[PDB]
Paper text:
Carbon monoxide dehydrogenase ([name]) and acetyl-CoA synthase (ACS) play major roles in the global carbon cycle through the consumption of CO and CO2 gases, production of acetate, and breakdown of acetate for methane generation. By contrast, methanogenic archaea employ four copies of [name] (α2ε2 heterotetramers) and eight copies of ACS (β monomers) that interact stably with eight copies of CFeSP (γδ heterodimers) to form a massive 2.2 MDa complex called the acetyl-CoA decarbonylase/synthase (ACDS) complex. ACDS plays a central role in that process, wherein the A-cluster of ACS cleaves acetyl-CoA into CO and a methyl moiety, the C-cluster of [name] oxidizes CO to CO2, and the corrinoid of CFeSP receives the methyl moiety, which is reduced to methane in downstream methanogenic metabolism. Through plunge freezing of the ACDS complex, we captured multiple subcomplexes including a [name] tetramer, a [name]/ACS pentamer, and a [name]/ACS hexamer and characterized these subcomplexes via cryogenic electron microscopy (cryo-EM).
Using a traditional blot-plunging method, α2ε2 [name] subcomplexes were observed. Sufficient [name] subcomplex was present on the grid to generate a high-resolution reconstruction, however, in 2D and 3D classifications of [name] particles, there were no classes containing additional density consistent with ACS. Here, we observe a similar phenomenon, wherein the full 2.2 MDa ACDS complex is dissociated to a lesser extent on the chameleon than on a blot-plunger; in both the blot-plunged specimen and the chameleon-plunged specimen, [name] particles were observed, but [name]/ACS subcomplexes were only observed in the chameleon-plunged specimen, suggesting that the ACDS complex underwent more dissociation under blot-plunging conditions. The use of two plunging methods allowed us to capture two snapshots of MetCODH, with global resolutions of 2.8 and 3.3 Å for the maps from chameleon and Cp3-plunged samples, respectively. The MetCODH α2ε2 heterotetramer shares the same topology as MebCODH and harbors the same set of metallocofactors, including E- and F-clusters, which are not present in monofunctional and acetogenic CODHs. In the structures of MetCODH without ACS bound, this CO channel is closed. In both cases, helix αA shifts toward helix αB to close the gas channel and block CO release. Additionally, helix αA residue Arg500(Met)/Arg142(Moor) has repositioned so that it no longer hydrogen bonds to the A-cluster coordinating Gly279(Met)/Gly596(Moor). This type of protein motion in [name] is quite interesting, as conformational motion is not precedented in CODHs.
Numbering used by the authors:
A (entry chain B), C (entry chain A): 40 to 798
B (entry chain D), D (entry chain C): 4 to 170
């Protein structure tokens, strides 16, 4: 077919596009240190942008650190994909047609990057070999004296991001086409998520991690022996989504449950509910064994990436391991045999449920009396709290009797146990907060729609006109982790506000879990208040982190199916199209992990801006555009190659917001795109203006830079905005016919083709 | 207001100089083109009162970072909204017109900011720019030119009262 | 053939060995920092071995940092190997048989790890795919909250080390079998190494980096156009070794020269000698363009890993690039086309030699007048000096007139330019030192024997009996970088001392360059004072860093050829044999790079202890054995699996020495092995005792723990040591026949087989 | 001897307490099982003189790390050779009999050590062990319990003379 300039791209093939992006969106480096602790020549003081012993300056070191984070995230996703694909090929078979629904392009990222069009599962192995080889080449650059410019480190970070998206696509395709995941179903079943959805009177298996291959055998054993009714299995992190989507092509509600995000791991463990804990990989707290030994909770590892120092009993019989765990000889085991693990974990749950009875780390009513009337509010825990909660004030107010302060703190706390280790009184503050919010914990329930996987091309063809023309106000992609600044309600509030205005909201990862945990006055979550299709005012859950590739997939399929441009090895042109026409913005409010950084960078390279939380300023790189330099905002009209001016939107590719209201205003503004129809620009300007006036109290000061015609003004406020333009900015307005005759810097073009590439 | 300069994690070996109230007042009244950078934490009834008075004292223009603009709507101050991460990026460019169009600002006064946010934003200003930073918040900001020490809410309010008394 | 338990091993297959090793050699973690800045949950204070927000403690963080360094080094070596092998296959062909001399095991590391026996250049591609896939799996573990135990991070570091010794083997095999490198020649030509070996009256091309594929085209152009006589080409770092080994199967001396190690890069650039600088891939200072612009020195990059931000003009014609560089339009370029680069660099050297005339950054006298008599010895540079030289004192003494202090400091300085940025007077101290030692620079000449590659099986079969029995006192492998504490003479002194005692000294990397730069009273270097075969009292140079795999290959071939044990996928047994019988110790006096850490760890996993410089304590891990715990020193006799006691040797697997005399004593002691012949042990004890008495003034206090018989004692001092044993330790001695009858803890066994594996 | 505590690169927030001469003498004379850890830098004839006198004062056993044993051969002191990394590893094991066989040492006195070496060796002692460290060297050792400030050679010699005068 018609190929492209950059198939199987490397750091040198994508350099032109990366530098074109960085020319408008300058990188901003916020170093976390003024020292480089890398080789034995150092550490070198780089404060004041000085140079180390190798000559690297502060910007180079910050860029290297961010690039290392990006490649670490890409390596996580690629290793997950490789292991999952190998297991699927070994069990199911290599020659299995790929089944992702009724799509003309099952792999919109694989085709865009590697130029290939996979048909079976054996055609995903060369792609994974390309993502591992290039990952090795990129990790070779973190060495001392192996590069020196920050700009090329940024280019390699962009390449790592796109490779991460390719790896996520590979993993999601492999698991969806095999494990019977929903195939683009817009009405996937609603499932119950929450700590209070687990019945403590039954054996409980808590599956923490990200890989679903290991736990499929556990569920097969449970179904084959008729144990689903007499046992409970609950997932944490994205493995919960993967288990929930398992075998759900029949749309029947599942029996496995979702317990929460990473912030709930320590709370779940300390509550004593789990009877067995099985860990898989990726986001897994590195202190589970220490707490489980105190609470008599066995821990089974099932991976080579995570083994926790536990004894390896893979070749041992199941019964001997059960006896060894029951007698307390060992605090856990590492079972890499999937059949043996699937047999062992449920039997271990049965044999350990009666042994541990009401065992919990929560003080009941008496130890807390001293634990609260022992502290003197010395302020060390607040200094050690990542969120800087007023823990001494809350405890002091609890001393008088009012315990609602810690009840409030429970939502604002992430369960990290950093307050209990700086105290000089040895107060388990987290358990105190847990009991102070025990009522909420018992009433912590919600509904989340199961991951739909990939968006079919029918909905994409129906919605591409609205997206490109601007009729639909845009696609807000709420992704990322659960390291929120002010609790898990900011994402819910943003999603509700942007669904009330007919945006297309697409969620994935822990953000979907946090969104589905809150209810309105009628007790209905957002997932039952709004549908799950790909159109205006519809929230659709795409799945786990490995399914964050599907959002960029829809972004590329808008240019492929609708615009008609070819996808094979055409990263630059498709990214330019997405950056110039498609209105899509990502939001990672609680991103902490390197995987989130890799996903955000890959979305940047594809032309999708992203707004992160205040905690994500520790990634040491943002991409921000100078809105006062008129020389940056010039594109080439593809019809004749002449210079065409564009509005300053998006004014960034990665930025961090302080509060969720500022995030709402940013998301509303940065969905505006060049080549916006009159109706589309009118809708987007209307929504941005109302959001800014509601959440900041003032009209945006840059609103007059986005008006190219009276038609572009909001219909309800056309007169007042016309008066504002007439008086404040001296624009000449033909008032007889409500016409704008002088003042706009860019005349409205009926059909223009703005692009950044001269070719 | 300098007794407690304790920290949990350090950015390096160069830190902020813990200043008294008189030193802060002298620096505020000594700057040529100052800028009052106020975060969302200023919307606390106890702090929004002082911030407005400090701004009214020397007619300092205000950058109301985040969702803190609502507290400066009806007041008699020159307040404008700007993203902190975009403000920090713009302060390192000498050829930036500014919030009005007269250039950059030689010093920035910080009030009511989250510690982990302002520290990371100032890591890009104290290193790649030549702008002085005066942190009048209750926390100890390490990546600032001059900062207040750790203070309680009552002590922070008293220090702000002393500062405005000297302006 | 007869396979082994662990072919294509992973983190779980090598776990048993790794844990067997760590049971005797406990890890010692020296955390370089009290914080972790990995995810946005942090930074987390881990002082006092506290736990972060994810539960990781200080030991876990230090282990993760060291493991990240190890995988970075492994990735560097593996990427070098993959790129070199791809280029060789593309140009020469996939069907070429591997030519590594007369060896029945051309790949002693590939066969040991992957179980494969390559016979063609196309049989090295699956191996490199295994090293990239496992590298991706290992880099996936650096993610936040992935692993949770320091011991498993150590196990993964050991796996990363071995997969490095595999990647280095692949790269060396690929380049040796193709580029006509010497094939195990014990009479490789002596080449001139030194800055003063370059004639400033001719055009000079300085090749910095590690990859030789790019510069082979430059040399082909120079030879084809008859330019070797009228031009000079000099290499820095290991690319110099690769060039001087190019086409040297004919033993004719080369025309390319060696300028020095990494410590000489800035000095060479500032001296103004280079006319064109071409940078390949590794160990390249990241400030070359900044100095070259001031000294009008063009810079050409030739890799994707290193681009320096320079314009990419790969598709442009050579003449246009030459004109653009000559006019000063650009300060360099990136040329990934090898033929065009090979044509451009010599022509650029010709056209730029007459333009730059005596341009240098070395003030002679009058400009140095103020430069020296402006400082007031404020002591900041000494605070910023990594070696903590008395720079203020040297400058003050230079003010009076005596300039010999800086002349001395020149050898003790590494050219890192960290003293010129903390100064508040703006003194180019490095240039001051350079001129103060200008006379030495003019007299900086030496001879180094070209890399011999792999050790042939004939010499190994001749020397294995002496090595295993102990007749040869041991193999000292002086490897590593040039970050020496007290100049480049420590390695020379150690090599001379250990060659005077008939050890087998094998050198590689920058250490060979530093050893060959010093001469005795007759003006003969060690390479002409001693032969280059594999036997007692012979220094042999193996080549570059990629040739460090051949030392471990020799250690494995001792067990393969001599002991007769099979090699295919038999890592554990061969490593146990090497640790228990073969006397070999590595020395990395100036290791700074992550590659050195990976090489040291891989040598640890193979059972080869290593002594590092004092600067290598910043690697955050050592492997040290408790010499007072008698329970650690027990092995199993392979005849009947009974417990057999062994002497506390080696007392470490990785340690750091303070001075070179302590290093000599450590190397002498830790060459002692279990199952040492009464002669082998007499020789080793004699040498260790003499070295300890010479360099520390005292008899070793542990010498009586290594005596098992009268003949184990040194022959010359048998009587006095017998008296010492009789009086001090109460041993009962039959003085009639100088016999031992009571006192030795371990009886001498005529034929014992000590091993650590019960199986 | 505490005026200059300047550092180039830090390890964290917890640093060493710059102690005076009298404090050092009191701590040396107050310890129960002390250990004099002397590096190769003690071979300077200005320092080997004092080190021997300090050892003779309170009969402190000496760990002559590195190639510093030759300076303690003929002297009337109890000196033994040990590797610094091995010594630091052994000091974190409470069951170590010691250089003589009577257990560990509660405090270690450091003299004549290279900064980058002793700092990294002490990073494994101040974190994983319960051993006090008194650094009487002319440099400022950050990873020590109590250390001297940055001093010149003459000032370091004078401080050592004062230390011996108070012992
Ligand atoms: S990599 Fe460069 S900046 Fe970092 S420690 Fe080494 S020499 Fe210093
Ligand atoms: S650290 Fe402990 S004593 Fe201090 S305020 Fe917090 S809970 Fe109270
Ligand atoms: S566990 Fe919660 S309250 Fe304690 S430090 Fe962590 S976030 Fe703060
Ligand atoms: S980058 Fe991390 S480990 Fe290195 S000095 Fe800074 S906080 Fe410490
Ligand atoms: S990885 Fe763990 S220790 Fe490191 S910053 Fe994140 S939470 Fe803290
Ligand atoms: S930093 Fe400069 S002024 Fe200070 S002692 Fe060194 S050379 Fe002299
Ligand atoms: S350039 Fe030499 S003298 Fe200057 S700081 Fe580096 S090592 Fe020390």
């Amino acid at each position: 077919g018609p190929m492209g300039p950059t198939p199987f791209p490397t750091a040198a093939t994508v350099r032109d596009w990366s530098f074109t992006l960085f020319d408008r969106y300058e990188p901003v480096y916020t170093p976390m240190c003024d020292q480089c602790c890398y080789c034995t020549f150092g550490p070198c003081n780089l404060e004041g942008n000085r140079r180390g012993a190798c000559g690297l300056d502060m910007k180079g070191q910050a860029a290297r650190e961010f690039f290392l984070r990006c490649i670490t995230g890409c390596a996580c996703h690629s290793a997950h994909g490789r292991h999952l694909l190998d297991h699927i090929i070994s069990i199911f078979g290599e020659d299995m047609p790929i089944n992702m629904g009724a799509s003309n392009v099952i792999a919109p990222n694989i085709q865009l990057i590697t130029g290939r069009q996979p048909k079976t599962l054996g055609d995903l192995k060369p792609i994974m070999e390309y993502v591992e080889e290039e990952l090795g080449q990129l990790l070779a650059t973190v060495h001392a004296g192996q590069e020196g410019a920050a700009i090329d480190y940024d280019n390699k970070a962009m390449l790592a991001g796109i490779l991460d998206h390719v790896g996520m696509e590979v993993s999601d395709i492999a698991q969806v086409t095999a494990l019977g995941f929903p195939k683009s179903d817009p009405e996937a079943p609603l499932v119950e998520v929450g700590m209070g959805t687990l019945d403590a009177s039954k054996p409980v298996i808590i599956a923490i991690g990200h890989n679903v291959a290991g736990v499929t055998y556990i569920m097969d054993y449970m179904e084959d022996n008729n144990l689903t009714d007499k046992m409970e299995i609950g997932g944490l992190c994205c493995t919960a989504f993967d288990m929930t989507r398992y075998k759900r092509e029949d749309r029947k509600p599942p029996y496995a449950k979702i317990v929460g995000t990473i912030s709930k791991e320590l709370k779940v463990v300390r509550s004593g509910i789990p009877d067995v804990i099985v860990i898989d990989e990726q986001c897994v707290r590195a202190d589970l064994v220490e707490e489980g030994k105190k609470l008599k909770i066995p821990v089974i590892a099932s991976n080579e990436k995570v083994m926790y120092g536990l004894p390896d009993r893979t070749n041992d019989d199941v019964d001997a391991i059960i006896e060894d765990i029951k007698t307390g000889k060992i605090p856990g085991c590492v079972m890499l045999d999937y059949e043996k693990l699937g047999e062992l974990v449920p039997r271990l749950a049965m044999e350990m449920a009666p042994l541990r009875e009401g065992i919990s780390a929560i003080p009941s009513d008496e130890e807390m009396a001293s634990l609260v009337a022992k502290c003197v509010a010395c302020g060390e825990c607040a200094l050690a709290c990542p969120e800087e909660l007023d823990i001494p004030d809350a405890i002091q107010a609890a001393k008088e009797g009012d315990f609602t302060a810690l009840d409030f703190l429970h939502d604002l706390c992430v369960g990290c146990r950093r307050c209990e280790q700086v105290c000089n009184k040895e107060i388990p503050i987290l358990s105190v907060i847990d009991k102070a919010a025990q009522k909420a914990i018992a009433e912590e329930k919600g509904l989340v729609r199961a991951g739909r996987g990939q968006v079919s091309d029918a909905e994409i063809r129906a919605e591409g006109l609205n997206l490109v023309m601007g009729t639909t106000p845009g696609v807000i992609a709420i992704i990322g982790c659960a390291n929120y600044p002010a609790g898990s309600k900011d994402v819910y509030r943003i999603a509700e506000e942007f669904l009330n205005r007919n945006y297309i909201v697409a969620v994935s990862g822990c953000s979907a879990m946090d969104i589905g945990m809150y209810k309105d006055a009628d007790g209905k979550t957002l997932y039952e208040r709004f549908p799950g299709r790909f159109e205006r005012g519809n929230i659709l859950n795409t799945g786990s982190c490995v399914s964050n590739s599907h959002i960029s997939g829809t972004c590329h399929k808008v240019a492929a199916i609708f615009a008609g441009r070819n996808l094979s090895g055409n990263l630059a042109e498709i990214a330019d199209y997405t950056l110039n026409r498609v209105g899509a913005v990502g939001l990672a409010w609680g991103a902490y992990s390197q995987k989130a950084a890799a996903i955000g960078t890959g979305c940047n390279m594809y032309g999708i801006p992203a707004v992160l939380g205040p905690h994500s300023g520790k990634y040491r790189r943002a991409l921000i555009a100078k809105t006062y330099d008129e020389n940056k905002w010039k594109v080439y009209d593809s019809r004749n190659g002449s210079e065409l001016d564009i509005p300053p939107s998006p004014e960034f590719l990665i930025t961090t917001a302080e509060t969720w209201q500022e995030a709402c205003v940013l998301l509303a503004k940065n969905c505006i795109r060049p080549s916006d129809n009159n109706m589309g620009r009118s809708i987007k300007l209307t929504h941005w203006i109302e959001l800014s006036e509601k959440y900041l109290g003032v009209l945006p000061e840059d609103w007059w830079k986005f008006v190219r015609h009276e038609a572009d003004l909001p219909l309800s406020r056309r007169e007042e905005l016309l008066k504002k333009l007439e008086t404040e900015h001296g624009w000449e307005i033909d008032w007889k016919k409500k016409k704008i005759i002088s003042g706009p810097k860019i005349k409205f073009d009926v059909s223009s083709q703005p692009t950044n590439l001269k070719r | 207001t300098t007794k407690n300069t304790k920290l949990f994690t350090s950015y390096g070996v160069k830190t902020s100089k813990a200043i008294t109230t008189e030193v802060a007042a002298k620096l505020i009244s000594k700057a040529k083109r100052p800028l009052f950078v106020v975060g969302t934490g200023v919307l606390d009834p106890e702090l929004l009162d002082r911030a407005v008075k400090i701004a009214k004292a020397k007619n300092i223009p205000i950058a109301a970072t985040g969702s803190s603009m609502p507290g400066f709507v009806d007041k008699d101050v020159n307040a404008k909204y700007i993203n902190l991460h975009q403000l920090g990026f713009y302060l390192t460019d000498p050829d930036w017109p500014g919030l009005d169009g007269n250039g950059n600002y030689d010093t920035i006064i910080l009030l009511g900011h989250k510690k982990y946010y302002i520290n990371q934003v100032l890591s890009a200003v104290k290193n790649f720019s030549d702008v002085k930073s005066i942190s009048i918040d209750r926390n100890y900001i390490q990546n600032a030119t001059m900062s207040f020490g750790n203070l309680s809410k009552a002590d922070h309010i008293a220090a702000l009262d002393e500062v405005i008394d000297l302006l």
